[PDB]
């Protein structure tokens, strides 16, 4: 199933997925399209901090949903 991630400048990823992936794999698929470590990435839908040993499925995570993208640098 296509899922969109909006990141927060204006940027938008196409990605291929499914229910059986988890939120680590994903993370770790989302590399690939911008290149981003999964270890600074962070995804939040409604306030919802999402957790890498979560699948798709404890969210619903369904088709035409957008998700959210978050930048958490390591230094600054």
Same mark, same amino acid.
């Given at each position: 199933?296509?899922?969109? +991630?909006?990141?927060?400048?204006?940027? #938008?990823? #196409?990605?291929?997925?499914?229910?059986?992936? #988890?939120?680590?794999? +994903?993370?770790?698929?989302?590399?690939?399209?911008?290149?981003?470590?999964?270890?600074?990435?962070?995804?939040?839908?409604?306030?919802?901090?999402?957790?890498?040993?979560?699948?798709?499925?404890?969210?619903?995570?369904?088709?035409?949903? #957008?998700?959210?993208? +978050?930048?958490?640098?390591?230094?600054?």
């Amino acid at each position: 199933m296509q899922i969109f +991630v909006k990141t927060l400048t204006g940027k #938008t990823i #196409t990605l291929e997925v499914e229910p059986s992936d #988890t939120i680590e794999n +994903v993370k770790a698929k989302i590399q690939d399209k911008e290149g981003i470590p999964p270890d600074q990435q962070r995804l939040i839908f409604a306030g919802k901090q999402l957790e890498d040993g979560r699948t798709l499925s404890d969210y619903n995570i369904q088709k035409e949903s #957008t998700l959210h993208l +978050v930048l958490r640098l390591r230094g600054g």
